[PDB]
Each structure stands twice: as structure tokens, then as C-alpha cells.
Amino acid sequence: LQTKDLQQKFYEIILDIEQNNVQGKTGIQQLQKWEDWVRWIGNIPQYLKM
């Protein structure tokens, strides 16, 4: 199929986007923000893979 895979990707940004809330209900947003700081270094040559 073409919809399964095509949607199989976007369907992943729905479960990871909702977690941002579940990890902040008990006033612990930092819980998911922990390693999140790495987002700053999200430009390394990891996309092209040396």
C-alpha cells in the first residue's frame, strides 16, 4: 500500500506530540525536556552520515 507507509510516518508525530502533555501533568514538564536540550545540537552531520 501507499497510505499505510505514507501515514505510518506522520502517525508517529501524533503519539510523540501527545506525550509532551502526559509528561507535564504532574508539574514535571522537564521530564520530557531533559535530554530534549540536545535539540540545540540538532544540526550535526548526522543527517548526511559521514
- Each as own residue / partner, the long-range contacts of residues 19-22 (CB below 8 Å, 24 or more positions apart, any chain) are none
Cα–Cα nearest to 16, from 2, 3, 37, 32: 32
Tell the residue number behind the cell numbers 522537564, with chain if given.
30
DSSP state at residue 47: T
Single out the residue of 7, 11, 30 nearest to residue 20, CA to CA.
30
Distance from the Cα of residue 41 to its chain's centroid: 15
* Contact partners, residue 23, CB within 8 Å, separation at least 6: 29, 31, 32
Handedness of CA 30, 36, 39, 44 (dihedral sign): positive
50 secondary structure, DSSP code = -
18 in Cβ contact with 6 (< 8 Å): no
Helix, strand, coil shares, percent, the chain, to 5: 60, 0, 40
